[PDB]
Design a protein around this ligand. Structure first.
Ligand SMILES: Nc1ccn([C@H]2C[C@H](O)[C@@H](COP(=O)(O)NP(=O)(O)OP(=O)(O)O)O2)c(=O)n1
Ligand SMILES: [Mg+2]
Ligand SMILES: [Mg+2]
Length: 427
DNA sequence: ATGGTGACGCT
DNA sequence: AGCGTCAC
């Protein structure tokens, strides 16, 4: 029976990423409790990234900076750039490109977010194992690697524990067998050490990584020993790891589906799923989800690392909460123009860098009283990278929504505007 | 009043 | 197409 051990997959995730971008730029922020904040005026601004020094004080994301300062009076802050009246993330996108380009030298990557990429190292491992004629794997090749589940069986400090586990792992390895999945993961980890060394050397940024046989285990592994460490999760480690792993920790189960798995089956931990037949899981959660859960709780997943380094959409949005909701046509048109101007600049850059053009413009709004992320979503043709045309067109496709008799007024007021370019073609 | 991103499934 | 879920 298939054991889901055919691939070597890593997930690299940058440590407190936006903070590291700002600390590289401003040495005064290095090795300090510090956070990145967006929009100073309302409660000191919203925190969106937090250094590990600040995390020790209890500072978190989705905290107002005024409140964070109560937990950490010496907290240092770096502000997100604002342009055309809104937060602008260009600096972090550019830093992301630095890291993605380095990772791409080692293998084809799947960009999973601004600061994460999956890597399929199956081929690189095969070639490295051949150049490694015999040759045991030294612990010195794995200086920041944790082996999840080890040490076990018959030191009081972290690094001591890490080494004992690594020693047990390496001592047990079957280096004479090049088809051994554990051996393949170990070689994968050596390559990821090299990848992470290159990222830090060439950018100054530290990161963590997971190495396993699929994306979900690699992602889970990555978080086990953050920051600045990497973790190998073998197929064998899965039963003990999952036996006390809350279901919500597994990627895609952190929301309503995960909550329904818990409620419907009356379980708490990922490993408890093994008790159910594939048909039983499909009966509760659908064919796709059921099959996925049945395999995943056994450490098996087939979701491929997709060869994609570039985002498939480029979007610009702004919210206008509470009393600031947009109530005039002048207002709506001004802000659509602001969004369209940012989008134009990003699109033009994208076309020069990446030899493609977007062909569809998606416009989304939220009206006051409405409670969803988006109220109304409409698309139209994107034929010209011109901000005035795009903003004019967006207005055209959303002017239907103005239920107001007076058309110089806007009702109900708008609490969100969103412009997104999609459907890219080669150019 | 976290805000501003982005991928992908469903019908 | 437009809506919803899930994630950083
Ligand atoms: N809700 C969120 C989550 C992340 N981000 C941004 C800021 C983060 O630095 C960056 C990466 O997100 P992240 O990986 O979830 N956390 P971060 O890299 O800051 O810390 P780690 O826990 O990964 O060390 O995306 C955001 O702007 N809004
Ligand atoms: Mg990160
Ligand atoms: Mg991340």
């Amino acid at each position: 029976m298939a054991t889901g051990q055919d691939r070597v997959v890593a997930l690299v995730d940058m440590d407190c990423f936006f903070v590291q971008v700002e600390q590289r730029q401003n040495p005064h922020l290095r090795n300090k409790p510090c956070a990145v904040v967006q929009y100073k005026s309302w409660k000191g601004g919203g925190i969106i990234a937090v250094s590990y020094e600040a995390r020790a004080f209890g500072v978190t994301r989705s905290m107002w900076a005024d409140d964070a300062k109560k937990l950490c009076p010496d907290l240092l802050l770096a502000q997100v750039r604002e342009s055309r009246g809104k937060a602008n993330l260009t600096k972090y996108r550019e830093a992301s490109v630095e890291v993605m380009e380095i990772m791409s030298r080692f293998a084809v990557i799947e960009r999973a977010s601004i600061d994460e990429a999956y890597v399929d190292l199956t081929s690189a491992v095969q070639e490295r194992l051949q150049k490694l004629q015999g040759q045991p794997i030294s612990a010195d090749l794995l200086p920041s690697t944790y082996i999840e589940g080890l040490p076990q069986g018959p030191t009081v400090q972290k690094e001591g524990m890490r080494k004992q586990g690594l020693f047990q792992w390496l001592d047990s390895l079957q280096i004479d067998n090049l088809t051994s999945p554990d051996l393949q993961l170990t070689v994968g980890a050596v390559i990821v050490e090299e990848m992470r060394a290159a990222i830090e050397r060439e950018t100054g940024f530290q990161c963590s990584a997971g190495i396993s046989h699929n994306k979900v285990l690699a992602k889970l592994a990555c978080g086990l020993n953050k920051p600045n460490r990497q973790t190998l999760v073998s197929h064998g480690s899965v039963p003990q790891l999952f036996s006390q792993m809350p279901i919500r920790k597994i990627r895609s189960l952190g929301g309503k589906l995960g909550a329904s798995v818990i409620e419907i089956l009356g379980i708490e931990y990922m490993g408890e799923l093994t008790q159910f037949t594939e048909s039983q899981l499909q009966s509760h959660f659908g064919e796709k989800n059921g099959s996925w859960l049945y395999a995943m709780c056994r450490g098996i997943e087939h979701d491929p690392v997709k060869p994609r380094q570039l985002p498939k959409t480029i979007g610009c949005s702004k919210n206008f909460p509470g009393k600031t909701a947009l109530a005039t046509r002048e207002q709506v048109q001004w802000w659509l123009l602001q969004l369209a101007q940012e989008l134009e600049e990003r699109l033009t850059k994208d076309r020069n860098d990446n030899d493609r053009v977007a062909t569809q413009l998606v416009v989304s709004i939220r009206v006051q009283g409405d409670k969803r992320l988006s109220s109304l979503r409409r698309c139209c043709a994107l034929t010209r990278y011109d901000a005035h045309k795009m903003s004019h067109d967006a207005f055209t496709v959303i002017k239907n929504c103005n239920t107001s008799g007076i058309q110089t007024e806007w009702s109900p007021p708008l609490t969100m505007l969103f412009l997104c370019a999609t459907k890219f073609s080669a150019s």
